[PDB]
Symmetry: D2
Subunit: 337 residues, 4 copies
């Protein structure tokens, strides 16, 4: 009886505290700041645990949004997911993806297929003895289930991206990933990966946060999401599969029109599980800058396909999806008849 309508606006930042274009989104009446349910950003910086520019972007974005909304900055505590991934090597352009969602009473006619819907969950507080073990895995599975129900989705095959923010003291990102796999029926509780989990951890935040992007037959969005799996460090097929299953029909190269159909890409490039690529030795696990190089490579791959530097390229943590497999999701336009 209510149908979700999700939207995405990608706006550049020239520094972690640059909220000019972000603020102009609202001031022009283009976007209603009350409709915003998530901010997903790439900031310049190192991307390591002590990357303070990342926190500077987080704090800056929250303040700009709270002003646009006319509330104090601590309302947005549980009403909006703010996710800043630090480290923007090479072709990656820092930016913020503004995700909005309202619900409308009538489902428009002539929307082909399924459409994007967003769900949000919160974990019970996670304690440093949980971090890494069963107790964390279950508090995250609950929140994934809660975000699914918030998005009105029951079929896990319709879920294409699950971002989890947990606390830190690898472990957190490993236990959180499993929680998603359990909640999606990818792995039975009793007992190993999730194809669509993109995990983060940091700060002293204790309540975990789940942001879930799926599709629904009852969606009013003019967008659709799909995913793929990057099979090794040089593979573009995962990216291409995410774009294709999101609804672009192409063989191997996108036309300029098809490229512009792609609204955002969310790719996590964790380091590979071995140092052998296509039968040869690579340095990517020995490199002191492995974390920065992983994202430099991922960005090169995604941007070479979409021609859009404002892509969400995260990752660079050491491995433990499938062996040496990385998730990537793509959000693509879905237009009426």
């Amino acid at each position: 009886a209510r149908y979700p309508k999700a939207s995405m606006h990608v706006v550049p930042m020239l520094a972690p505290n640059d909220t000019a274009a972000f603020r102009a989104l609202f001031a022009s009446g283009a976007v209603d700041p009350a409709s915003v349910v998530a901010l997903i950003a790439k900031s310049e910086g190192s991307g390591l645990h002590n990357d303070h520019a990342r926190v500077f972007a987080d704090v800056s974005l929250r303040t700009a949004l709270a002003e646009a909304r006319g509330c104090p900055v601590e309302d947005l505590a549980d009403s909006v997911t703010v996710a800043v991934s630090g480290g923007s090597p090479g072709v990656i352009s820092p930016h913020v993806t503004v995700v909005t969602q309202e619900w409308v009473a009538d489902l428009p006619a002539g929307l082909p297929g399924v459409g994007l819907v967003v769900g949000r969950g919160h974990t019970e507080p996670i304690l440093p003895e949980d971090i890494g073990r069963t107790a964390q895995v279950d508090k995250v599975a609950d929140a994934v289930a809660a975000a699914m129900l918030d998005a009105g989705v029951t079929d896990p095959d319709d879920v294409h991206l699950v971002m989890v923010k947990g606390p830190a003291l690898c472990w957190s990102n490993d236990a959180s990933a499993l929680g998603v796999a359990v909640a999606l029926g990818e792995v039975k509780r009793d007992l190993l990966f999730s194809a669509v989990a993109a995990t983060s951890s940091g700060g002293e935040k204790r309540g975990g946060e789940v942001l879930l992007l799926a599709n629904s037959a009852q969606s009013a969005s003019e967008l659709r999401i799909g995913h793929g799996i990057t099979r090794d460090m040089a593979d573009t097929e995962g990216i291409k599969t995410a774009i294709r299953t999101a609804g672009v029909d192409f063989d191997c190269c996108l036309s300029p029109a098809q490229q512009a159909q792609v609204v955002q890409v969310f790719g996590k490039f964790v380091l590979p599980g071995s140092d052998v690529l296509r039968g040869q030795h690579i340095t990517a696990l020995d490199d002191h800058e492995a974390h920065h190089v992983a994202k430099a490579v991922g960005g090169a791959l995604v941007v070479s396909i979409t021609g859009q530097p404002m892509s969400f390229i995260s990752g660079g943590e050491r491995n433990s999806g499938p062996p040496g497999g990385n998730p990537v999701a793509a959000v693509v336009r879905r237009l009426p008849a």
Copy 2:
């Protein structure tokens, strides 16, 4: 007599690992006397003080001299050794062994033109000339000398010119235009096919030139392209295509294996705007490493071959890239 050039790509697991390199000769597969250039990527930083680079240079020369049964200082001016340090990401350290021989009979059914190799030497370059006209036409001289060594007269047949000059940015820019002048790309601005290095105190420069010739016996052919921006794969594809692979946009696994080596120089862009957006690649403290990380990602995603020659990362928006591809009898 007709030139027969060949290329053998062999991996290195460290700068001093010459095992598979030594096995090239010991198995009788390659004649160490025919080797005219070694072009390698080493692990390390790639900065002016990258000692692992030099370790690979020294290690390779010693292995080759043993395979030849001579002292290491004869290979001084008979073989071009070029090691580019810094192998981030998908780049696998390796050495490309280039051999060249002159046979009396030109095999039948070799299509089109074929790979040919030329070498030149500059007269010693003087450290006030480094960066100035005196370096320019003194490398133009060596470029001309390398063309004549390869038996090539048409500059449109020259697809890669590697120059190694001495260090003290500018050397690489003064060397580049020396190439542009010798190729008639510029009348005494840039060169589409110059790939410049600088380092050491070696006051004598070295030129290595790769071209095609109608009278070539090589089972190889070279082509080049221009990388338009930092995210552009079309330069790479053009190099492969003009080297003789016929494809629209994606290579089959069979076509991928036809590509023997790629030589890409990824200098930093001239601005920090890419596809209308701001990028961090000129502010980054690791810009030199990231530039090569990106170039390697682009090349390897197209060829699936981690043992590619990805150099660059010096401050400057167009970059050269050459590809060497199989050319098989009818």
Copy 3:
């Protein structure tokens, strides 16, 4: 009226941690209206694009404006905020809160001269002037204006001059000699006491000057020294000694605690020879971080106080250092 300057050193656990800073005022210990400068070390890289630096600047200004109950843009020209990024090794991030007030009665039994603070502002500096004579005498002007704000006429009483100019190496060198000219160290070469910064687009420069005066009510005194090479502790010891600690070579734990803050600029040396030997400090890719790592080691080993102001690491063999020390009634 006689100036009373004070200094409160408070730790920060991150660039935005203003807890202990805010508690300074909330406890009634310090009057936020009396604050005339904030000088901080932040965690981060210290390079031109160190955003954690700016995060600390923004965070501190906001905390101070709240403590004052005013909007953050009044403090624009009433308070000098100087954050130096990059805190390797033994350097503990912190902010030194400098206050200054004018009392009508000069306390009795204050020995010698005492600390006094002056502030100047340059008229906007124009980006072609950056590096050129137009910046020089336009900061010399502000240095002169800061001297008159502190009521000091004898340049031998000036021990630290911090200048923040805009960025685009040279700014820091053109600012330095503007100080040297205003102090009569140079007639329209170097300044023994200039500590220069450059960044942002702020076309208006800021000068913060620390000196002594016979009519000072401060319970503090400042002195300076010159670090002769990269391994020299004598500059630091001279600064402490001329600030009024009487010691031969080592400080007692009591004398150590007398030292309130040290301001040391560790620019890279002019050569790569130290005590007759070759060092790597100019070749190192992390030279800027290492320079400050070494300076912090030297200072902290002498004072035992990790919350010291260690700046520098720009390319150039003498470096300035000032020390502020307790001056207690008879």
Copy 4:
């Protein structure tokens, strides 16, 4: 009936492969290459596990020595300890310390006190299941005992520096350190640190190597060694104690004459066990360059005391001597009456 005579020559290297001044040591007849029992060097480079410049210095030095000796380079395999520590930040000048030792039949008269003696041991081969556990600890204790007996030393209080090179896969350097503590009676086998162990690990070398520097009443050396403990990251007292107990009589500052008495200093600056220094927070454990900064700081401390940039400053690995305590030894002149 035989008395050891140990010597040390510190010669600069301007690059890892620069053996000019090293070679001139022998060619001038100043030093007999047959007498060399150890080479201890600092090389320019990163100091990380994949520092190839370090190996370049190792290979270069071995070749120069074998030529000076007129033998093939693989004789020196077990006759000379070659130890290159990579990473030379700040005031540290790359160099090699050439240690020689012969034995003479008559003990010179008028040598005050005890004097330097060198001992060398070899472990039984260490296997990657040993690395980190009891089996490694015991194969290293044996070699420490063997080097003690090679040096003619029975009293562990006379042992001031024990360098161990083990293989890698922290663990190795932790199990090797314990082996030294066991062999020196600092810790009973049944069961935690050694004040004088300086451990390394790398390569595929499997036989461990122990280089031990001690004193003996029966020593003919014109040198003496002593040690101290660096109590925290800003402490100079450990260095000063090593110099003082090696036989320089000073209160707090060395005269230029006393400085030149100090022949070499061997300081290992492992990262501290906490991030609190003198009651304040420091960044030295969060820093991405912690390994390089630790050695930059150690070098600053040592060189500020001796004025000699050619000092052996090693370390920068994460902690696990006493809590946040680092060893340092000093070798100092001991001259006849």
